[model samples]
Target: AAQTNAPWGLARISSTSPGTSTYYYDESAGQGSCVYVIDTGIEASHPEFEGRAQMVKTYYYSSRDGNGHGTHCAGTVGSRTYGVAKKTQLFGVKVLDDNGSGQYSTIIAGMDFVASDKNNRNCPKGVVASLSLGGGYSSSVNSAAARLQSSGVMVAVAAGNNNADARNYSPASEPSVCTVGASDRYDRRSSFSNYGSVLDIFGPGTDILSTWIGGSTRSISGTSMATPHVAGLAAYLMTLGKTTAASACRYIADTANKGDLSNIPFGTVNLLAYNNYQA
Candidate 1:
């Protein structure tokens, strides 16, 4: 981490700091898994991805990352230099536009693509998806997200940045998906992050360092940023045989670092996402 300019978010998940022996993850952590960034497009040319990242589906405009949000999330998920699962295949599904927003129909179209890939055997290994975009309650999106999970994609979603009850939002409120909230470096909830019973876990989301477009990097803070950390963790675990959404979610909760956070809001579970050091 010291050598790579990796951020504190990477430091928060492990028992020890990064190194050859205890670097918070294995060199082959994501070997047999693939992650889909279901948001804005990813800059495939970013050097951090080691050419392992690409735009496989674009429901919006051209398959290029004008907005860096999807690329940022992709980097956290599997970039070779700044990611959690360095060995995973990363694909960008451009559901949102350059402004980092999209309608429900467009987002659902991308989800359909992910579902078809996993079900049609195009993605043979375990699969994971990070949905960092969401809004208030939408039954259509919620159902589609559930269907995506049912179709065998390990779905992780942002719990929203509204600072209100996450259960009020779609996808995050969807029971079949892993809804992720945000925790700061101090192990406190991000002031802008939504919480409540809907959250499956929390991840480092404040001032997270990740890849940007045009061969650059940047810092971000939000539940949107937190979701990919868990998605990356899911990818890593899937490579270790936790292939199903239910299997990975169970291991994540059972093995996560518990009782270590502070200033947590009411009604929110405090299971912070752990790197599952053994993996």
Candidate 2:
């Protein structure tokens, strides 16, 4: 993924507006919205995540700090401190164990929890769900993900870090779900980012600065990072009355920073412009 040349002061805008243009005019901050980050539990006290951090619900299929991967991924999507959507709420569901492995059933249970919070156990509200981890799509995951959408919950998935066609991946390749690929600081696809028509958009997945375990900070990369950037953005859009996932995705695509529509390939999103809109 090629990164947009970020102009000075444009840390919030495509300050270096490509000779091309994007849709958003610079007001996509999700000030009054909530997004559910379905990953490992997070450090609620991270510096970057002060003032704006909130948790609707949390569940651990394994145990706390089982494997650090979910926590790191949670930081990317909802950590107030270095997250693109620091203002959004996070739902930490531990589908994976401390060993960093789990069954699809557990993951499905997490999804079910997100959609079915009638008991207010976890994610009682219909917060947008961001999924940074998943195996290939199984009937169970597919059903759960579909039920999530049908029930009005938004789901964002990883295109995987294998750098292959996303079509071969699960969850991310799910039709109703929006799959994310990875791009670098230069806006170029990362060698590790999966690409293909199934990829809905690209995000700051490579070398991203985010929170780590023990309240430390690290610069890591992956489609994992990109998924939260979009997840947060989607929450903002939903708050603006763009309720459906398709509409929210369209808002992002139409507002992206691809100078030339033709320059965009299949499955790529235009965040450069998407970040410029007025809320």
Candidate 3:
């Protein structure tokens, strides 16, 4: 069966059975795929996650979520109800410290760990890493992302929230990963989102609601929130059984809703949509 994209106005990429109560995707949505949230850690046992989320490893704070950012991003990627690939195994790699900040070296360490050891227990050859963090540009992180792509790891990074050219940031400007920007529910470019030639796509980010820290839900806004939408979709493509990281990137870029934001610079840059799935 061919996959179908969600209709416009349905901002959540995982919404199913439109105009009905089943707003979430089915349990087998991404059964064979995996997504890693390389952020602050995850609350593995949160009610939103139940038993589906886990902390594979951590560079800070005992492999648990003290800060909710990681959990929030993880939920968007695979929280059953709020997620894009609901059944995809969710792993957390804590690169950020308790204050929701990390050095470029810490970020690189997380990426290197994922590139080398995650596959033994994660998604084997095709895994998606969702990064919702960024700062000054780092050549080391850029090189690490490039290496991960060579290792068959598909990466999705936030295009920064500074409202400037994302090309000034580290991983966002990196060529190997799919860089994401934020758009509002009305398909408008987010006022706080950075844009430029480096952005690979845009997704709903303003006032977006997803799984929060303590099994609760909250609405937050940022390009950080938008990256997971693409990562989750990339994981969704992986479950189709024949996509590599590069092909998944191409599928998403080629099939985006282009007419959404034509007036803004890089506004319609591969606007995220689930409308057409050939595999």
Candidate 4:
């Protein structure tokens, strides 16, 4: 299918400015990249994945998604019918449990596996991941994410839904991670989205519809939901470059539709994530 048939989040990113049209993205978008969903597990058999999505690792003991958060997040990243990067392969690295809770150790464990797999894998275009969870700051979490970024795996993380400054949160406050805020279809900052300078960009997060467990689909909202779109975008954009985390982040920000969003919080950058497409 063409970009015109994409979900709103996908459609929104593929344009320079706001408003709608038949969106446009390169046909080869995200053709040869990988995205790791570092959250709850994913339902690998969900038809939306087309066999491209699977649960490759689990720190939460369970190998499948009992909670729908991970599946929804993964769908936004690269599901065949409701995703940003339509062709990126997805790996579910379950850092959080079915209850959507975990320690920094488990989270760090997920990163360890991904960073290693990325280096040894045949991902010539790039590897990327998104973390839709955050808490108060943790030095351990920061360094782990830093190591992943330093190891050349581009990562996107949620800015948190606390409605407070993201600088106070864990991986969200980690400088090495590309922290994302939430924007709605109207190009306005989501009321619940964490803000401030820690945010690297904004993605459509409000009322986002994506795949869920039970081989179903649903609409949910969060900065968690927003992060995957950027992760997917990074997966697609990095394919055009050498694929360093910083370089991928810089390209996404530099190419974004600058100062186009309304109701941006005081310290948040006004850049909205874009897929470098026009019309």
Report the number of the highest-TM-score candidate. 4
lDDT of 1: 0.83
Assess the local accuracy of residue 135 in candidate 3 as a C-alpha lDDT between 0 and 100: 88
- Give the range of the ten consecutive residues with the poorest summed lDDT in model 2: 1-10
lDDT digits (tens) for residues 1-279 of candidate 4: 355556678878887656674556766668788899998888989999999888888865578999999999999998887887878889898888898998888898888789897765566678998999988999888888888888888989999999889889989998878999999988999989999987889999998989999999999999999999999999988765634556887778888889988888676799988876643
Error of 1 at 3 (Å): 7.2
Q: How does each model score on TM-score? A: 0.93, 0.79, 0.88, 0.95
Off by over 4 Å in 3: 1-27, 122-125, 266-270, 275-279
**Candidate 2 structure quality by residue, lDDT tens digits, 1-279:** 112432111233332442332223224335455565666655555565664444444444333554456556666654544544544565566666666566788778888887775235333223677888767657677778778766667788888998677776677777777777766656567678877777666666767666776768777777877787777767756655555554666567666666432234555554432455443
lDDT of every model, 2 decimals: 0.83, 0.61, 0.75, 0.85
Could you give me the TM-score of model 3 versus the true structure?
Answer: 0.88
What is the C-alpha local distance difference test score of candidate 4? 0.85
Better of 1 and 2 by TM-score: 1
- Lowest-sum lDDT 10-residue window in model 1: 14-23
Which of 3 and 4 is ahead in lDDT? 4
Query: What value does the lDDT take at residue 97 in candidate 4?
Result: 86
Where does model 4 exceed 4 Å of error?
Answer: none
lDDT of 3 by residue, 116-220 (tens): 866577574368899999988888888888887777788999999998988899898898788898877666788998988888888767776677777787778
User: Comparing candidate 1 with candidate 2, which one achieves the higher lDDT?
Assistant: 1
Candidate 3 C-alpha error for residue 220, in Å? 0.4
In model 3, residue pairs whose N, Cα or C atoms come closer than 3 Å (at least 3 residues apart or on different chains), thus clashing, are 5-274, 5-275
**Better by TM-score, candidate 4 or 3:** 4
